[PDB]
PDB file of all heavy atoms in Angstrom:
ATOM      1  N   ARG S  78     170.675  -6.160  -7.638  1.00 44.14           N
ATOM      2  CA  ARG S  78     169.977  -6.303  -8.813  1.00 44.14           C
ATOM      3  C   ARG S  78     168.688  -5.500  -8.803  1.00 44.14           C
ATOM      4  O   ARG S  78     168.368  -4.838  -9.799  1.00 44.14           O
ATOM      5  CB  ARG S  78     169.645  -7.755  -9.116  1.00 44.14           C
ATOM      6  CG  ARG S  78     170.865  -8.441  -9.775  1.00 44.14           C
ATOM      7  CD  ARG S  78     170.683  -9.896  -9.832  1.00 44.14           C
ATOM      8  NE  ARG S  78     171.837 -10.549 -10.575  1.00 44.14           N
ATOM      9  CZ  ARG S  78     172.071 -11.759 -10.677  1.00 44.14           C
ATOM     10  NH1 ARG S  78     171.315 -12.660 -10.018  1.00 44.14           N
ATOM     11  NH2 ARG S  78     173.086 -12.196 -11.359  1.00 44.14           N
ATOM     12  N   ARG S  79     168.028  -5.466  -7.669  1.00 42.49           N
ATOM     13  CA  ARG S  79     166.822  -4.681  -7.623  1.00 42.49           C
ATOM     14  C   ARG S  79     167.115  -3.175  -7.386  1.00 42.49           C
ATOM     15  O   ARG S  79     166.252  -2.348  -7.685  1.00 42.49           O
ATOM     16  CB  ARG S  79     165.883  -5.191  -6.549  1.00 42.49           C
ATOM     17  CG  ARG S  79     166.312  -4.930  -5.143  1.00 42.49           C
ATOM     18  CD  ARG S  79     165.476  -5.743  -4.201  1.00 42.49           C
ATOM     19  NE  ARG S  79     166.220  -6.005  -2.895  1.00 42.49           N
ATOM     20  CZ  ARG S  79     166.213  -5.220  -1.878  1.00 42.49           C
ATOM     21  NH1 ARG S  79     165.552  -4.039  -1.923  1.00 42.49           N
ATOM     22  NH2 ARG S  79     166.810  -5.504  -0.747  1.00 42.49           N
ATOM     23  N   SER S  80     168.256  -2.869  -6.844  1.00 39.49           N
ATOM     24  CA  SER S  80     168.638  -1.498  -6.629  1.00 39.49           C
ATOM     25  C   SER S  80     169.220  -0.798  -7.885  1.00 39.49           C
ATOM     26  O   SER S  80     169.434   0.459  -7.796  1.00 39.49           O
ATOM     27  CB  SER S  80     169.619  -1.373  -5.439  1.00 39.49           C
ATOM     28  OG  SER S  80     168.999  -1.749  -4.208  1.00 39.49           O
ATOM     29  N   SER S  81     169.525  -1.588  -8.848  1.00 37.62           N
ATOM     30  CA  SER S  81     170.079  -1.044 -10.092  1.00 37.62           C
ATOM     31  C   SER S  81     169.385  -1.719 -11.331  1.00 37.62           C
ATOM     32  O   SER S  81     169.989  -2.458 -12.091  1.00 37.62           O
ATOM     33  CB  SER S  81     171.616  -1.335 -10.141  1.00 37.62           C
ATOM     34  OG  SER S  81     172.211  -0.727 -11.207  1.00 37.62           O
ATOM     35  N   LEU S  82     168.143  -1.401 -11.466  1.00 37.19           N
ATOM     36  CA  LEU S  82     167.296  -1.988 -12.563  1.00 37.19           C
ATOM     37  C   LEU S  82     167.338  -1.015 -13.710  1.00 37.19           C
ATOM     38  O   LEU S  82     166.908   0.051 -13.677  1.00 37.19           O
ATOM     39  CB  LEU S  82     165.813  -2.112 -12.085  1.00 37.19           C
ATOM     40  CG  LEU S  82     165.420  -3.467 -11.368  1.00 37.19           C
ATOM     41  CD1 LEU S  82     163.987  -3.289 -10.963  1.00 37.19           C
ATOM     42  CD2 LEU S  82     165.708  -4.625 -12.273  1.00 37.19           C
ATOM     43  N   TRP S  83     167.971  -1.533 -14.822  1.00 38.38           N
ATOM     44  CA  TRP S  83     168.142  -0.598 -15.991  1.00 38.38           C
ATOM     45  C   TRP S  83     167.166  -1.020 -17.047  1.00 38.38           C
ATOM     46  O   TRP S  83     167.326  -2.163 -17.614  1.00 38.38           O
ATOM     47  CB  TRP S  83     169.580  -0.736 -16.527  1.00 38.38           C
ATOM     48  CG  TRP S  83     170.554  -0.147 -15.570  1.00 38.38           C
ATOM     49  CD1 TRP S  83     170.364   0.390 -14.328  1.00 38.38           C
ATOM     50  CD2 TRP S  83     171.969  -0.050 -15.763  1.00 38.38           C
ATOM     51  NE1 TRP S  83     171.502   0.844 -13.794  1.00 38.38           N
ATOM     52  CE2 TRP S  83     172.539   0.578 -14.692  1.00 38.38           C
ATOM     53  CE3 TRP S  83     172.788  -0.477 -16.867  1.00 38.38           C
ATOM     54  CZ2 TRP S  83     173.865   0.822 -14.523  1.00 38.38           C
ATOM     55  CZ3 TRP S  83     174.207  -0.263 -16.715  1.00 38.38           C
ATOM     56  CH2 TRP S  83     174.717   0.374 -15.544  1.00 38.38           C
ATOM     57  N   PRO S  84     166.129  -0.252 -17.366  1.00 38.88           N
ATOM     58  CA  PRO S  84     165.112  -0.704 -18.312  1.00 38.88           C
ATOM     59  C   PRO S  84     165.335  -0.324 -19.701  1.00 38.88           C
ATOM     60  O   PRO S  84     165.914   0.673 -20.060  1.00 38.88           O
ATOM     61  CB  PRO S  84     163.851   0.080 -17.791  1.00 38.88           C
ATOM     62  CG  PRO S  84     164.438   1.301 -17.240  1.00 38.88           C
ATOM     63  CD  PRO S  84     165.806   1.021 -16.678  1.00 38.88           C
ATOM     64  N   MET S  85     165.044  -1.290 -20.593  1.00 37.99           N
ATOM     65  CA  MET S  85     164.895  -1.029 -22.036  1.00 37.99           C
ATOM     66  C   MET S  85     163.405  -0.849 -22.212  1.00 37.99           C
ATOM     67  O   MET S  85     162.645  -1.808 -22.017  1.00 37.99           O
ATOM     68  CB  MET S  85     165.399  -2.251 -22.859  1.00 37.99           C
ATOM     69  CG  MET S  85     165.306  -1.928 -24.337  1.00 37.99           C
ATOM     70  SD  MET S  85     163.802  -2.523 -25.145  1.00 37.99           S
ATOM     71  CE  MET S  85     163.875  -1.750 -26.681  1.00 37.99           C
ATOM     72  N   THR S  86     162.944   0.320 -22.690  1.00 39.02           N
ATOM     73  CA  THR S  86     161.599   0.663 -22.914  1.00 39.02           C
ATOM     74  C   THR S  86     161.244   0.432 -24.298  1.00 39.02           C
ATOM     75  O   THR S  86     161.860   1.117 -25.182  1.00 39.02           O
ATOM     76  CB  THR S  86     161.242   2.039 -22.354  1.00 39.02           C
ATOM     77  OG1 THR S  86     161.623   2.194 -21.026  1.00 39.02           O
ATOM     78  CG2 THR S  86     159.732   2.354 -22.455  1.00 39.02           C
ATOM     79  N   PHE S  87     160.208  -0.403 -24.641  1.00 34.39           N
ATOM     80  CA  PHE S  87     159.689  -0.476 -25.896  1.00 34.39           C
ATOM     81  C   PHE S  87     158.502   0.467 -25.995  1.00 34.39           C
ATOM     82  O   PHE S  87     157.389   0.096 -25.596  1.00 34.39           O
ATOM     83  CB  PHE S  87     159.297  -1.892 -26.256  1.00 34.39           C
ATOM     84  CG  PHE S  87     160.170  -2.605 -27.259  1.00 34.39           C
ATOM     85  CD1 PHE S  87     160.834  -3.821 -26.886  1.00 34.39           C
ATOM     86  CD2 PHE S  87     160.359  -2.057 -28.502  1.00 34.39           C
ATOM     87  CE1 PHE S  87     161.654  -4.434 -27.828  1.00 34.39           C
ATOM     88  CE2 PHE S  87     161.146  -2.752 -29.446  1.00 34.39           C
ATOM     89  CZ  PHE S  87     161.811  -3.860 -29.077  1.00 34.39           C
ATOM     90  N   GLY S  88     158.780   1.699 -26.390  1.00 31.44           N
ATOM     91  CA  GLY S  88     157.704   2.716 -26.469  1.00 31.44           C
ATOM     92  C   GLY S  88     156.824   2.504 -27.669  1.00 31.44           C
ATOM     93  O   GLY S  88     156.966   3.295 -28.592  1.00 31.44           O
ATOM     94  N   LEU S  89     155.904   1.609 -27.626  1.00 29.36           N
ATOM     95  CA  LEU S  89     155.148   1.224 -28.818  1.00 29.36           C
ATOM     96  C   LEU S  89     154.086   2.227 -29.144  1.00 29.36           C
ATOM     97  O   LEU S  89     153.902   2.561 -30.361  1.00 29.36           O
ATOM     98  CB  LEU S  89     154.638  -0.147 -28.744  1.00 29.36           C
ATOM     99  CG  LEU S  89     155.682  -1.279 -28.498  1.00 29.36           C
ATOM    100  CD1 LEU S  89     155.008  -2.676 -28.340  1.00 29.36           C
ATOM    101  CD2 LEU S  89     156.589  -1.314 -29.699  1.00 29.36           C
ATOM    102  N   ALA S  90     153.416   2.740 -28.105  1.00 28.16           N
ATOM    103  CA  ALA S  90     152.252   3.614 -28.362  1.00 28.16           C
ATOM    104  C   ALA S  90     152.033   4.559 -27.162  1.00 28.16           C
ATOM    105  O   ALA S  90     152.965   5.009 -26.588  1.00 28.16           O
ATOM    106  CB  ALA S  90     150.984   2.785 -28.737  1.00 28.16           C
ATOM    107  N   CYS S  91     150.776   4.819 -26.826  1.00 31.04           N
ATOM    108  CA  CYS S  91     150.502   5.885 -25.857  1.00 31.04           C
ATOM    109  C   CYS S  91     150.969   5.621 -24.530  1.00 31.04           C
ATOM    110  O   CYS S  91     151.326   6.533 -23.711  1.00 31.04           O
ATOM    111  CB  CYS S  91     149.018   6.178 -25.859  1.00 31.04           C
ATOM    112  SG  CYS S  91     147.954   5.243 -26.926  1.00 31.04           S
ATOM    113  N   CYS S  92     151.067   4.286 -24.090  1.00 32.31           N
ATOM    114  CA  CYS S  92     151.589   3.960 -22.758  1.00 32.31           C
ATOM    115  C   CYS S  92     152.992   4.514 -22.629  1.00 32.31           C
ATOM    116  O   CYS S  92     153.454   4.698 -21.493  1.00 32.31           O
ATOM    117  CB  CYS S  92     151.529   2.449 -22.599  1.00 32.31           C
ATOM    118  SG  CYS S  92     149.949   1.860 -21.944  1.00 32.31           S
ATOM    119  N   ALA S  93     153.717   4.611 -23.725  1.00 31.12           N
ATOM    120  CA  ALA S  93     155.122   5.193 -23.668  1.00 31.12           C
ATOM    121  C   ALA S  93     155.100   6.625 -23.097  1.00 31.12           C
ATOM    122  O   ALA S  93     156.075   7.072 -22.593  1.00 31.12           O
ATOM    123  CB  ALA S  93     155.729   5.186 -25.041  1.00 31.12           C
ATOM    124  N   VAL S  94     153.978   7.338 -23.240  1.00 29.89           N
ATOM    125  CA  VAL S  94     153.904   8.705 -22.730  1.00 29.89           C
ATOM    126  C   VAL S  94     153.931   8.687 -21.221  1.00 29.89           C
ATOM    127  O   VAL S  94     154.542   9.541 -20.608  1.00 29.89           O
ATOM    128  CB  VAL S  94     152.725   9.449 -23.334  1.00 29.89           C
ATOM    129  CG1 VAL S  94     152.514  10.760 -22.614  1.00 29.89           C
ATOM    130  CG2 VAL S  94     152.852   9.612 -24.838  1.00 29.89           C
ATOM    131  N   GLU S  95     153.148   7.855 -20.622  1.00 28.94           N
ATOM    132  CA  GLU S  95     153.100   7.801 -19.151  1.00 28.94           C
ATOM    133  C   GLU S  95     154.427   7.270 -18.608  1.00 28.94           C
ATOM    134  O   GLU S  95     154.791   7.535 -17.468  1.00 28.94           O
ATOM    135  CB  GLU S  95     151.945   6.867 -18.649  1.00 28.94           C
ATOM    136  CG  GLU S  95     150.615   7.543 -18.737  1.00 28.94           C
ATOM    137  CD  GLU S  95     150.371   8.514 -17.603  1.00 28.94           C
ATOM    138  OE1 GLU S  95     151.325   9.076 -16.990  1.00 28.94           O
ATOM    139  OE2 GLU S  95     149.177   8.695 -17.258  1.00 28.94           O
ATOM    140  N   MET S  96     155.210   6.513 -19.378  1.00 27.60           N
ATOM    141  CA  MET S  96     156.528   6.130 -19.024  1.00 27.60           C
ATOM    142  C   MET S  96     157.449   7.266 -19.013  1.00 27.60           C
ATOM    143  O   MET S  96     158.307   7.370 -18.151  1.00 27.60           O
ATOM    144  CB  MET S  96     157.043   4.968 -19.952  1.00 27.60           C
ATOM    145  CG  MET S  96     158.461   4.602 -19.708  1.00 27.60           C
ATOM    146  SD  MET S  96     159.615   5.576 -20.636  1.00 27.60           S
ATOM    147  CE  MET S  96     161.016   5.712 -19.550  1.00 27.60           C
ATOM    148  N   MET S  97     157.312   8.195 -19.975  1.00 28.05           N
ATOM    149  CA  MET S  97     158.129   9.362 -20.000  1.00 28.05           C
ATOM    150  C   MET S  97     157.785  10.229 -18.832  1.00 28.05           C
ATOM    151  O   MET S  97     158.675  10.804 -18.163  1.00 28.05           O
ATOM    152  CB  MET S  97     157.893  10.257 -21.281  1.00 28.05           C
ATOM    153  CG  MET S  97     158.451   9.542 -22.495  1.00 28.05           C
ATOM    154  SD  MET S  97     157.745  10.227 -24.052  1.00 28.05           S
ATOM    155  CE  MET S  97     158.884  11.648 -24.306  1.00 28.05           C
ATOM    156  N   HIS S  98     156.511  10.290 -18.360  1.00 27.14           N
ATOM    157  CA  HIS S  98     156.091  11.045 -17.205  1.00 27.14           C
ATOM    158  C   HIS S  98     156.693  10.451 -15.916  1.00 27.14           C
ATOM    159  O   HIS S  98     156.868  11.125 -14.910  1.00 27.14           O
ATOM    160  CB  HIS S  98     154.579  11.132 -17.103  1.00 27.14           C
ATOM    161  CG  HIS S  98     154.064  12.249 -17.976  1.00 27.14           C
ATOM    162  ND1 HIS S  98     153.573  13.444 -17.428  1.00 27.14           N
ATOM    163  CD2 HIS S  98     153.908  12.333 -19.334  1.00 27.14           C
ATOM    164  CE1 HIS S  98     153.162  14.247 -18.399  1.00 27.14           C
ATOM    165  NE2 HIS S  98     153.385  13.622 -19.587  1.00 27.14           N
ATOM    166  N   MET S  99     156.857   9.090 -15.901  1.00 25.34           N
ATOM    167  CA  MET S  99     157.544   8.459 -14.791  1.00 25.34           C
ATOM    168  C   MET S  99     159.048   8.856 -14.607  1.00 25.34           C
ATOM    169  O   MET S  99     159.537   8.939 -13.542  1.00 25.34           O
ATOM    170  CB  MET S  99     157.389   6.996 -14.842  1.00 25.34           C
ATOM    171  CG  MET S  99     157.792   6.247 -13.546  1.00 25.34           C
ATOM    172  SD  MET S  99     157.733   4.466 -13.708  1.00 25.34           S
ATOM    173  CE  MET S  99     159.101   4.120 -14.845  1.00 25.34           C
ATOM    174  N   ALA S 100     159.631   9.099 -15.822  1.00 23.96           N
ATOM    175  CA  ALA S 100     161.026   9.614 -15.743  1.00 23.96           C
ATOM    176  C   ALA S 100     161.063  11.104 -15.500  1.00 23.96           C
ATOM    177  O   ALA S 100     162.135  11.567 -15.063  1.00 23.96           O
ATOM    178  CB  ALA S 100     161.705   9.305 -17.107  1.00 23.96           C
ATOM    179  N   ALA S 101     159.920  11.752 -15.711  1.00 23.98           N
ATOM    180  CA  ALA S 101     159.917  13.271 -15.537  1.00 23.98           C
ATOM    181  C   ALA S 101     160.085  13.646 -14.108  1.00 23.98           C
ATOM    182  O   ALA S 101     159.962  12.720 -13.189  1.00 23.98           O
ATOM    183  CB  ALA S 101     158.620  13.806 -16.134  1.00 23.98           C
ATOM    184  N   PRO S 102     160.277  14.910 -13.772  1.00 25.37           N
ATOM    185  CA  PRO S 102     160.666  15.356 -12.423  1.00 25.37           C
ATOM    186  C   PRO S 102     159.764  14.789 -11.282  1.00 25.37           C
ATOM    187  O   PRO S 102     160.293  14.444 -10.233  1.00 25.37           O
ATOM    188  CB  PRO S 102     160.700  16.810 -12.455  1.00 25.37           C
ATOM    189  CG  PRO S 102     161.043  17.094 -13.849  1.00 25.37           C
ATOM    190  CD  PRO S 102     160.341  16.091 -14.671  1.00 25.37           C
ATOM    191  N   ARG S 103     158.440  14.792 -11.519  1.00 27.37           N
ATOM    192  CA  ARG S 103     157.546  14.519 -10.404  1.00 27.37           C
ATOM    193  C   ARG S 103     157.888  13.089  -9.829  1.00 27.37           C
ATOM    194  O   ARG S 103     157.867  12.956  -8.583  1.00 27.37           O
ATOM    195  CB  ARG S 103     156.106  14.514 -10.833  1.00 27.37           C
ATOM    196  CG  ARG S 103     155.196  13.993  -9.722  1.00 27.37           C
ATOM    197  CD  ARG S 103     153.796  14.518  -9.908  1.00 27.37           C
ATOM    198  NE  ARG S 103     153.692  15.922 -10.014  1.00 27.37           N
ATOM    199  CZ  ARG S 103     152.611  16.634 -10.274  1.00 27.37           C
ATOM    200  NH1 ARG S 103     151.417  15.986 -10.367  1.00 27.37           N
ATOM    201  NH2 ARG S 103     152.590  17.920 -10.347  1.00 27.37           N
ATOM    202  N   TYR S 104     158.126  12.131 -10.657  1.00 27.04           N
ATOM    203  CA  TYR S 104     158.375  10.750 -10.112  1.00 27.04           C
ATOM    204  C   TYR S 104     159.785  10.390 -10.240  1.00 27.04           C
ATOM    205  O   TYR S 104     160.273   9.710  -9.231  1.00 27.04           O
ATOM    206  CB  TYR S 104     157.550   9.826 -10.914  1.00 27.04           C
ATOM    207  CG  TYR S 104     156.022  10.015 -10.675  1.00 27.04           C
ATOM    208  CD1 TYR S 104     155.289  10.667 -11.645  1.00 27.04           C
ATOM    209  CD2 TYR S 104     155.498   9.675  -9.529  1.00 27.04           C
ATOM    210  CE1 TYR S 104     153.943  10.866 -11.345  1.00 27.04           C
ATOM    211  CE2 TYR S 104     154.189   9.880  -9.223  1.00 27.04           C
ATOM    212  CZ  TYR S 104     153.373  10.494 -10.139  1.00 27.04           C
ATOM    213  OH  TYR S 104     152.104  10.776  -9.900  1.00 27.04           O
ATOM    214  N   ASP S 105     160.587  10.867 -11.118  1.00 30.28           N
ATOM    215  CA  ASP S 105     162.031  10.690 -11.217  1.00 30.28           C
ATOM    216  C   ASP S 105     162.468   9.273 -10.828  1.00 30.28           C
ATOM    217  O   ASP S 105     163.037   8.969  -9.851  1.00 30.28           O
ATOM    218  CB  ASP S 105     162.745  11.656 -10.212  1.00 30.28           C
ATOM    219  CG  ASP S 105     164.195  11.712 -10.311  1.00 30.28           C
ATOM    220  OD1 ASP S 105     164.749  11.347 -11.394  1.00 30.28           O
ATOM    221  OD2 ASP S 105     164.852  12.033  -9.285  1.00 30.28           O
ATOM    222  N   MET S 106     162.173   8.461 -11.830  1.00 31.66           N
ATOM    223  CA  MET S 106     162.541   7.018 -11.669  1.00 31.66           C
ATOM    224  C   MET S 106     164.028   6.829 -11.454  1.00 31.66           C
ATOM    225  O   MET S 106     164.451   5.830 -10.857  1.00 31.66           O
ATOM    226  CB  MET S 106     162.089   6.216 -12.960  1.00 31.66           C
ATOM    227  CG  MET S 106     163.001   6.386 -14.120  1.00 31.66           C
ATOM    228  SD  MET S 106     162.197   6.198 -15.693  1.00 31.66           S
ATOM    229  CE  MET S 106     162.545   4.491 -16.112  1.00 31.66           C
ATOM    230  N   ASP S 107     164.882   7.777 -11.937  1.00 33.49           N
ATOM    231  CA  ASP S 107     166.322   7.719 -11.725  1.00 33.49           C
ATOM    232  C   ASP S 107     166.664   7.664 -10.214  1.00 33.49           C
ATOM    233  O   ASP S 107     167.595   7.024  -9.826  1.00 33.49           O
ATOM    234  CB  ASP S 107     166.963   8.897 -12.402  1.00 33.49           C
ATOM    235  CG  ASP S 107     168.506   8.779 -12.340  1.00 33.49           C
ATOM    236  OD1 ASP S 107     169.010   7.767 -12.812  1.00 33.49           O
ATOM    237  OD2 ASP S 107     169.140   9.708 -11.922  1.00 33.49           O
ATOM    238  N   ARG S 108     165.812   8.309  -9.417  1.00 32.82           N
ATOM    239  CA  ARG S 108     166.131   8.322  -7.933  1.00 32.82           C
ATOM    240  C   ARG S 108     166.023   6.999  -7.316  1.00 32.82           C
ATOM    241  O   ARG S 108     166.540   6.763  -6.165  1.00 32.82           O
ATOM    242  CB  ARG S 108     165.218   9.389  -7.245  1.00 32.82           C
ATOM    243  CG  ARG S 108     163.856   8.823  -6.787  1.00 32.82           C
ATOM    244  CD  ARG S 108     162.969   9.944  -6.272  1.00 32.82           C
ATOM    245  NE  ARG S 108     161.787   9.400  -5.612  1.00 32.82           N
ATOM    246  CZ  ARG S 108     161.679   8.761  -4.462  1.00 32.82           C
ATOM    247  NH1 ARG S 108     162.786   8.599  -3.786  1.00 32.82           N
ATOM    248  NH2 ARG S 108     160.546   8.375  -4.022  1.00 32.82           N
ATOM    249  N   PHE S 109     165.373   6.045  -7.899  1.00 34.88           N
ATOM    250  CA  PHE S 109     165.312   4.585  -7.493  1.00 34.88           C
ATOM    251  C   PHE S 109     166.410   3.767  -7.929  1.00 34.88           C
ATOM    252  O   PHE S 109     166.448   2.573  -7.676  1.00 34.88           O
ATOM    253  CB  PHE S 109     163.930   4.014  -7.839  1.00 34.88           C
ATOM    254  CG  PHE S 109     162.729   4.708  -7.271  1.00 34.88           C
ATOM    255  CD1 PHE S 109     162.131   5.763  -7.969  1.00 34.88           C
ATOM    256  CD2 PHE S 109     162.225   4.324  -6.118  1.00 34.88           C
ATOM    257  CE1 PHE S 109     161.043   6.404  -7.454  1.00 34.88           C
ATOM    258  CE2 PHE S 109     161.099   4.969  -5.551  1.00 34.88           C
ATOM    259  CZ  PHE S 109     160.541   5.982  -6.273  1.00 34.88           C
ATOM    260  N   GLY S 110     167.377   4.369  -8.743  1.00 38.33           N
ATOM    261  CA  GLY S 110     168.391   3.533  -9.436  1.00 38.33           C
ATOM    262  C   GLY S 110     167.935   3.077 -10.799  1.00 38.33           C
ATOM    263  O   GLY S 110     168.706   2.329 -11.446  1.00 38.33           O
ATOM    264  N   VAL S 111     166.753   3.521 -11.262  1.00 33.75           N
ATOM    265  CA  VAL S 111     166.231   3.057 -12.568  1.00 33.75           C
ATOM    266  C   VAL S 111     166.626   4.148 -13.599  1.00 33.75           C
ATOM    267  O   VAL S 111     165.933   5.167 -13.670  1.00 33.75           O
ATOM    268  CB  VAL S 111     164.667   2.888 -12.561  1.00 33.75           C
ATOM    269  CG1 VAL S 111     164.142   2.411 -13.809  1.00 33.75           C
ATOM    270  CG2 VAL S 111     164.365   1.915 -11.420  1.00 33.75           C
TER     271      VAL S 111
END
């Protein structure tokens, strides 16, 4: 369950931008199974 965490992101405002940056190549949340 922790190795396959699938998020629903409620991108309400500016915090959604830093969430996009977490998916972006530098951090690549996908590499954690997210």
Side-chain angles (χ1 to χ4, degrees):
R78 277 169 175 169
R79 72 192 156 85
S80 296
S81 186
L82 273 177
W83 293 0
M85 184 267 166
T86 305
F87 253 121
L89 298 177
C91 358
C92 273
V94 171
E95 283 279 29
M96 176 270 145
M97 292 163 88
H98 277 253
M99 189 182 74
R103 170 156 312 173
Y104 295 104
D105 186 26
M106 77 208 263
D107 189 54
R108 89 187 186 74
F109 300 89
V111 183

